[PDB]
Design an enzyme around this catalytic site. Sequence first.
Site, PDB file in Angstrom:
ATOM      1  N   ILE A  18      -4.048  -2.853  -2.563  1.00 16.23           N
ATOM      2  CA  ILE A  18      -4.619  -3.978  -3.300  1.00 16.23           C
ATOM      3  C   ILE A  18      -5.490  -4.719  -2.292  1.00 16.23           C
ATOM      4  CG2 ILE A  18      -4.140  -6.130  -4.556  1.00 16.23           C
ATOM      5  CD1 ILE A  18      -1.367  -4.735  -5.333  1.00 16.23           C
ATOM      6  N   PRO A  47       0.848  -1.202   0.000  1.00 21.61           N
ATOM      7  CA  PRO A  47       0.000   0.000   0.000  1.00 21.61           C
ATOM      8  C   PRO A  47       0.868   1.231   0.000  1.00 21.61           C
ATOM      9  CG  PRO A  47      -0.826  -1.604   1.584  1.00 21.61           C
ATOM     10  CD  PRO A  47       0.474  -2.149   1.068  1.00 21.61           C
ATOM     11  N   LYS A  89      -1.186  -5.770   6.039  1.00 26.19           N
ATOM     12  CA  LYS A  89      -0.137  -5.977   5.050  1.00 26.19           C
ATOM     13  C   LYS A  89       1.225  -5.892   5.731  1.00 26.19           C
ATOM     14  CE  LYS A  89      -2.985  -5.298   1.386  1.00 26.19           C
ATOM     15  NZ  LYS A  89      -3.259  -6.387   0.421  1.00 26.19           N
ATOM     16  N   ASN A 102      -8.549  10.092   0.350  1.00 25.61           N
ATOM     17  CA  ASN A 102      -9.125   9.312  -0.748  1.00 25.61           C
ATOM     18  C   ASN A 102      -8.613   7.891  -0.702  1.00 25.61           C
ATOM     19  OD1 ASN A 102     -10.579  11.461  -1.784  1.00 25.61           O
ATOM     20  ND2 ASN A 102      -8.886  12.187  -3.067  1.00 25.61           N
TER      21      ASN A 102
END
Lengths: 114, 114, 114
Positions: free
Chosen positions: B64, B1, B32, B97
């Site tokens: 992801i 990420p 992650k 976002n």
Amino acid sequence: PMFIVNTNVPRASVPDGFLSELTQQLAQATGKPPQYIAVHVVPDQLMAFGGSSEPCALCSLHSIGKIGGAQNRSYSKLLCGLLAERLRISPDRVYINYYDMNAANVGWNNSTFA
Amino acid sequence: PMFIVNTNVPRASVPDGFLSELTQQLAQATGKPPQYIAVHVVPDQLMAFGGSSEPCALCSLHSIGKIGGAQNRSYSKLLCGLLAERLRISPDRVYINYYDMNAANVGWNNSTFA
Amino acid sequence: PMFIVNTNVPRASVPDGFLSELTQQLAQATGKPPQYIAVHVVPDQLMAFGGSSEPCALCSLHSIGKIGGAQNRSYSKLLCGLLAERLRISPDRVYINYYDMNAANVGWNNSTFA
Ligand SMILES: C[C@H]1O[C@@H](O[C@H]2[C@H](Oc3cc(O)c4c(c3)O[C@@H](c3ccc(O)cc3)C[C@H]4O)O[C@@H](CO)[C@H](O)[C@@H]2O)[C@H](O)[C@H](O)[C@H]1O
Ligand SMILES: [Cl-]
Ligand SMILES: [Cl-]
Ligand SMILES: [Cl-]
Ligand SMILES: [Cl-]
Ligand SMILES: [Cl-]
Ligand SMILES: [Cl-]
Ligand SMILES: [Cl-]
């Protein structure tokens, strides 16, 4: 298309000719006229990759089409190769986010590409 | 990420270790490994929120997977909390976002994650 | 919306009042309350457009709804007009990427807009 690279590498370590090489190589790779390729390099950033601050890069490529599984693998090889050779950034410290833009969602010259 | 924060607060106000704290907190929140978390902080920006240039931030989290309604609410509490405590930015002057990336659209290490 | 402009135009060439004009004109064009509109201008960038480093701009506009074919054309005329008048950037050297965000993917004030 638009290609942006953000990196912790200092500005003085970005060689002459780097934006032009990105423009030319992306025009070839994407099949788009170089007149439509925009490139943006942002050095000297405060960034970490995996919690460490050796040279790294966070990038994006936006294009109206010419984005997909095999194409993106090819772009990643090309772009990691350039960042490794020119900025001395290891490919395992690069992320590139790919965006397949709808034409109606890209503004240019007082309108959109739709 | 990848987590990016753009803010008008001055670079001197970003505490040492902030990038490492973001890395570890995002690793825990997303599940992650920290080796795959990249963080980028951009201070000293020319920005306004509601017409006011009091401290504010515009941020993005790309991952992801591990993106969704409930997860994003939890990330927003975590990240606004960190920006308030560490950078003194009010949560009501922060946008984040969230992007759930397809593996084929994230390049890394000469290929993509697909 | 939130609006970001990245440009090679120098900071001293961004006129006083520019962020306010962007905030107010985006309020008018979208009908969104100005108190929540965010604007971010990034001058002095190392960028090229078509291989040339004449003034250019790479921008994004994110909104929850209010994105679409006709709306984006109207935003592009408004925003290119402002960049031409105020920053002296030719509209054919501006790209604006438009993003229609799901409310669940926008964090604000410890939560999301969902
Ligand atoms: C006002 C009031 O309204 C309610 O929120 C509503 C939300 O309000 C806004 C109002 C806006 O002005 C702005 C918002 C959303 O997003 C900013 C943004 C957009 C995209 C980004 O990527 C990042 C930031 C842009 C901005 O200008 O708008 C809807 C869409 O209509 C939602 O459906 C949602 O109901 C909630 O009660 C919220 O607590 C309360 O403050
Ligand atoms: Cl394109
Ligand atoms: Cl799109
Ligand atoms: Cl990821
Ligand atoms: Cl979820
Ligand atoms: Cl994606
Ligand atoms: Cl909006
Ligand atoms: Cl979305």
